[PDB]
A paper describes a structure:
Bacterial conjugation mediates contact-dependent transfer of DNA from donor to recipient bacteria, thus facilitating the spread of virulence and resistance plasmids. Here we describe how variants of the plasmid-encoded donor outer membrane (OM) protein TraN cooperate with distinct OM receptors in recipients to mediate mating pair stabilization and efficient DNA transfer. TraN is an OM protein containing 22 conserved cysteine residues and is involved in the formation of mating aggregates during MPS2,17,18. In addition to resistance plasmids, mutations affecting the K. pneumoniae OM trimeric channel-forming porins OmpK35 and OmpK36 (homologues of OmpF and OmpC in E. coli, respectively) also contribute to reduced carbapenem susceptibility.
Cryo-EM analysis revealed that TraNpKpQIL interacts with OmpK36 through the insertion of a β-hairpin in the tip of TraN into a monomer of the OmpK36 porin trimer. A clear shift in the retention volume of the TraN-OmpK36 sample (12.8 ml) was observed compared with the individual retention volumes of TraNpKpQIL (14.5 ml) and OmpK36 (14.9 ml), which indicates the formation of a stable TraN-OmpK36 complex. The structural basis of the TraN-OmpK36 interaction was assessed by cryo-electron microscopy (cryo-EM), which showed discrete TraN-OmpK36 complexes. However, TraN was mainly disordered and exhibited an occupancy of less than one molecule for each OmpK36 trimer. A three-dimensional (3D) reconstruction for the complex with an overall resolution of 2.6 Å using the map:map approach was generated with density for both the OmpK36 trimer and TraN. The additional density below OmpK36 was assigned to TraN and it extends into the channel of one subunit of the trimeric porin. The density inside the pore is better defined, showing a loop-shaped appearance with side chains; using the AlphaFold model for TraNpKpQIL, that density corresponds to the predicted β-hairpin of the TraNpKpQIL ‘tip’. TraN inserts into the OmpK36 pore from its extracellular side and reaches halfway through the channel to L3. The binding/recognition of the TraN β-hairpin is mostly mediated by interactions with L3 of OmpK36.
Residue numbers in the entry:
A (entry chain B): 0 to 344
B (entry chain D): 0 to 8
C (entry chain A): 0 to 185, 189 to 344
D (entry chain C): 0 to 184, 188 to 344
The structure:
């Protein structure tokens, strides 16, 4: 980003982007203008030679609606923490789950992708009140092995027996949970990762929605990645238990998510990309049985003028078949085309 | 809804 | 603005203001504190010797209400674009309409003014999803002639047949539309034209305003020399001017004139007159005055960063059934302000 | 704060903090994550050798809720003003009341404390449309004596006879009011007095609190030397202290005292006691305790940019009909924090 201050061992970095984005689709819920921008600040202070403090805030503003609209801006990241030489780091606040450490390898598409999981969905994406301890090189015992733990406090309902101060609907509630991740670089380019999470489920999550009954939400993830010679390859496979949203109908008892992405970077700045994503649910209630929650193929490309300006086109080919489950759960089954013009600072 | 410094509730 | 970063051919400009503002009026809907602030950023990157990219964001935050209030901040501008040297420029996002290119010459009042049209009102002001191509010197032909092309996508209802992702009420919906503008320095003269499709909800929900297309023709004049500022513009609209909350006016004629003088020690008195007459309204309203008032005020500039002003609006509208039903204010307003600009 | 711009006699200061905060309590309305952050800007321009203009904006963003939640950000401070050398200063906008000039001496606790009053509560805390004139050293008569006047406009209901443009519920409405403060000197003494009119809505909607005016008398003491901080303030209010959600207390007597000691290596343990007793309450409530608790905690400062703290609030209130009806919490709270300040 743009470093706007560096004095007395304290540095401030201001970063963000403005995205002029348009969607072309037959689905009236996604077609139209999608302009927005991001703004954020990253700080870091040098407490001493072997202790360092830092903090980061990221904020999202929607600019595709009228000036009288409501709920057009929200916070994505907000956390403060400490770095202890090379013994690790700790931070608390709104931050990414440890499952993202593996699942982000395939989240490199121009506009789409990374939608087999939602935000505020246990420890798979950005969450609230996550205490994350991260260790690099595994205490120095083995080089190149990253490692992390996580703990998340309960986020209950707006009111009732299981309420907390920050209430929310059953789709984003959770109990006390923890997660771990482990990524290693076998050699140059090739890397492997593995993640695991386990959280408690609130009472409303077991009574209000029609689909999904269980006590614990579990997630197993394993990914692979190749990044060298202007070639990017990545894939990740995930199996969840009572942790994947089946649209607005509730949660899927068993789900298997698979994402694969292939990208190449040209000399003059063009970066074509091809990807495939799917998400299959099993053992759903109400006689739904086994249904496809997500299935589409993504083709697109990106052009980089420089490190501050770029434009892209993204085509999502939806392979889902319309049926009772998709209509009831409100899952879109239409193709979408996106055009973007981004300025980054 | 509280005295100016650390907002409560 | 304050240039806070300039490295690697990329510069960031931070700009904004804090306005301590108070209104003195008999209309309880406008009387009271009106304190607010603006904050924004302007960027520009040097891609090469003849190509340039840029982006601009503007944010408005209202600070005249309590800490538990809702919907006190909103975005005014957000767009990104490219400049092809002297061959023109293109940008997309939330930006001004091409009609503003001519109607902004009279939007120089201290506090009031520029209210014959509203925001998110077709292509007359700030709008959503507008793709604008602007060309200076009109390619390689006559110098001093500015030309602009614009296209806006559909912004439909919240839900239903004509819905889009960003739904809104009928007062701010629109169909596919385009607009042109043309200004020349000879003293300056300008002309603007816009044409947009009207949504189905706009033709059924409100009581006033029936038509397929929204039309706008604008012509303007400007004099800016020897510490004297004179400007005026005349606009004729078809199914494009809001008749308060009752809907749209079938025909409307807007006229604004402003005169200003800048003193050597910092005082800038201003006098202006604004009017807007609607015609062929339904419900038996006939011809009604939508807006009519005289503005007298002055501004004192301590320097480029600090200023204060007093604005007096003398409302000449007459109270009747149409004004009360449409919710149009007919009371004088006095504004006092103290602005710090950074 | 971080000074990010200083050119042409104009300077801009950017400040804020990110607070990773967690609450441990048996009260489900306060237990859980409480992460938030603050951001703001301070400006100042040199008009001439003896005149100066300035402006300050402070904005609060909550980050402990989901991205689809509502009303998570609000503005705390926004004002612009002028400084006439040593003859005083004047500013208008959303600013602190003059009662805060004395009641902030005891508002130094890590997380809790300073809650015998509320924001947007007459002139005791941050308010809307306050015009403040502040004079340092009392013109030239004496040295070391600070002095201030304030005036606030009416902030009426959302709609009705007493409405203004910025309407609000009866808990935050007020009429015309004014206030004065007077601080003199490591021992310091302070005195503040405010007087505001009460709106008609405040006298009819809530069950508790009837009167024409809201008055506040505050006396303060402070000791700040040799790494020792002692401060206490006693306040007597008249129809100006909220009795939870039931209305206003006819008479209240607030008393808060704080003792802190700063250690050499950065530890700052603190002990405080707060109480607030209401009198002459209607509905047969009689005399009740609105707030009563003991605060014990400590703060560690790694440097001027990073710090951490633990705060333990021991609630001494007894659960009864008044506390349950007014929604006043009677549970202990433990807070853990990790703050980065820039």
């Amino acid at each position: 980003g743009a470093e706007i201050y560096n004095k007395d061992g304290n540095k401030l970095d201001l970063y963000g982007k403005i995205d002029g984005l348009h969607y072309f689709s037959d689905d009236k819920s996604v077609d139209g203008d999608q302009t927005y921008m991001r703004v954020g600040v990253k700080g870091e202070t040098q407490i001493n030679d072997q202790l360092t403090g830092y903090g980061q805030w990221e904020y999202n503003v929607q600019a595709n609606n009228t000036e009288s609209s409501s709920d057009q801006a929200w916070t994505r990241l907000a956390f403060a923490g400490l770095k202890f030489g090379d013994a690790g780091s700790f931070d608390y606040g709104r931050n990414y789950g440890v499952v993202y450490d593996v699942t982000s390898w395939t989240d490199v598409l121009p506009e789409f992708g990374g939608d087999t999981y939602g935000s505020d969905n246990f420890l798979q994406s950005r969450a609230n009140g996550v205490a994350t301890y991260r260790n690099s090189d595994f205490f120095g015992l083995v080089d190149g092995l990253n490692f992390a733990l996580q703990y998340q406090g309960k986020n209950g309902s707006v009111s009732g027996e299981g309420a907390t101060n920050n209430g929310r609907g059953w789709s984003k509630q959770n109990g006390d949970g923890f997660g771990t991740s482990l990524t290693y670089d076998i050699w140059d380019g090739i890397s492997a990762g593995f993640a695991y999470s386990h959280s408690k489920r609130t009472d409303e999550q077991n009574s209000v929605p029609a689909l999904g009954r269980g006590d614990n939400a579990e997630t197993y993830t394993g990914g692979l990645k190749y990044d060298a010679n202007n070639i990017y390859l990545a894939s990740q496979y995930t199996q969840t238990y009572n942790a994947t949203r089946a649209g607005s109908l509730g949660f899927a008892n068993k789900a298997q998510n698979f994402e694969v992405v292939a990208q190449y970077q040209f000399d003059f700045g063009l970066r074509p990309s091809v990807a495939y994503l799917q998400s299959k649910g099993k053992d759903l209630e109400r006689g739904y049985g086994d249904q496809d929650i997500l299935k589409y193929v993504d083709v697109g490309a990106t052009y980089y003028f420089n490190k501050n300006m770029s434009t892209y086109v993204d085509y999502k080919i939806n392979l889902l078949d319309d049926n009772s489950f998709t209509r009831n759960a409100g899952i879109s089954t239409d193709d979408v085309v996106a055009l973007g013009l981004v300025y980054q600072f | 809804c509280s005295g100016g410094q650390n907002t409560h509730c």
